[PDB]
Design a binder for this molecule. Structure first.
Ligand SMILES: [Ca+2]
Ligand SMILES: [Zn+2]
Length: 387
């Protein structure tokens, strides 16, 4: 379709992810297939990459995304900081797109928990935070323009394999141990070891707010064990919490669709229905870690009281496919299956793809999936959107 808008693309990672200079240059967006930002740019779709805290709360990552985009010191809010016990202020950024302050807009393409992070940034841009505005007045302290409301610079959000209603994987007995083993597998796919105390940061978790950092002489193995016991794994202000079915419910209750923004969901599935009791099993080609450690659980876990029945068993290795088309559990957002015309203010469900959680970003191979073709056709669609 004809190009109707000049808004640039921002790629936003999941509960794992890292900037373009990190991980010795192994891109999260393209992995072993190449560099997805490079593909869109060289095909005339100007594209940028955000890097926020992968284990942090969506709230933290919205404030991190904001500063990273417009430029400034990350401002988590005086109130939120007091309530949860971390720094009000994080890293300073120069700003990728200061023209957002002057009328420029962006399309966000987000993977995994990134789709929650993207939705929430919109909701804060539009409404801000009553509580922050209240707190800034009471204790005579500065307010981020983010908490004010009346901002708007996101023309479209696209979610790819996003736990909008959470993932049942979080309810696994040993999820803690199994989740940081996922972080290690991603490292290994990056050709980075978990048992070597690298001098340089390699993978920065951006836990400035919690005063956490991998230390001189500290391995990722030893660091992850330490993060397991830390507030970025034990508190409600975390990716862990937001990622649970109860986390997404509580997020859905306050993070709604802006009428000024297009939402596209892409769902993923990489499972087959078994004959014995209708459980779901990993297809051939699923990333080894998911196929062994995550999928068997995802595609047999039931809670009939929490609505978690057979619709929840199909999974992309990591997320229950049903959770992906858009928010439902605790949401009044509308979900319309794609009919050739993209609608503002609603979820354009662009369908389910035979592609696993890590294949869809190229962190695992799948020759059957044309990853260049997928991301180009998406950029072409987002460029076609009426502003
Ligand atoms: Ca594969
Ligand atoms: Zn926080």
């Amino acid at each position: 379709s004809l190009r109707a808008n000049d808004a640039p693309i921002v790629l936003l990672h999941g509960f794992t992810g890292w900037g373009r200079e990190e991980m010795f240059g192994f891109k999260y967006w393209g992995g072993v297939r190449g560099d997805i930002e490079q593909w869109l740019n060289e095909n005339g779709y100007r594209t940028y990459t955000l890097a926020v805290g992968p284990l942090s709360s969506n709230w933290d990552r919205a404030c991190e995304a904001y500063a990273q985009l417009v430029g400034g010191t990350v401002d988590y809010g005086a109130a939120h900081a007091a309530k949860h016990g971390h720094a009000r202020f994080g890293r300073t950024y120069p700003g990728l797109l200061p023209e957002l302050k002057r009328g420029g807009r962006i399309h966000i393409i987000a993977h995994s928990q990134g789709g929650q992070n993207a939705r929430m940034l919109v909701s804060l841009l539009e409404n801000g935070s009553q509580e922050e505005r209240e707190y800034a007045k009471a204790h005579n302290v500065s307010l981020s323009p983010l908490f004010e409301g009346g901002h708007h610079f996101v023309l479209s959000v696209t979610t790819i394999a996003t736990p909008h209603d959470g993932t049942t994987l979080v309810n696994m007995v040993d999820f803690t141990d199994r989740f940081f083993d996922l972080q290690k597998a991603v490292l290994e796919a990056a050709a980075v070891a978990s048992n070597v105390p690298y001098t340089s940061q390699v993978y920065d978790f951006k836990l400035d707010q919690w005063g956490l950092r991998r230390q001189p002489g500290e391995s990722f193995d030893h660091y992850f064990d330490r993060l397991k016991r830390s507030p970025v794994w034990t508190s409600t202000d975390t990716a862990r919490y937001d990622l649970s079915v109860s986390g997404a419910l509580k997020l859905n209750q306050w993070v709604q669709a802006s009428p000024n923004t297009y939402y596209l969901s892409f769902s993923t599935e990489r499972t087959y229905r078994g004959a014995l009791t209708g459980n779901h099993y990993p297809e051939l080609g699923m990333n080894a870690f998911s196929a062994v450690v995550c999928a068997p659980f995802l595609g047999s876990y039931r809670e009939p009281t929490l609505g978690i029945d057979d619709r929840w068993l199909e999974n992309d290795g990591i997320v229950n496919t049903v959770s992906m088309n858009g928010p439902k559990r605790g949401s009044s957002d509308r979900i319309v299956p794609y009919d050739g015309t993209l609608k503002k203010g609603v979820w354009n469900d662009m369908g389910t793809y035979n592609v696993d959680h890590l294949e869809i970003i190229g962190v695992d191979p799948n020759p059957s999936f044309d990853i260049r073709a997928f991301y180009l056709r998406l950029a072409e669609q987002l460029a076609s959107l009426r502003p």
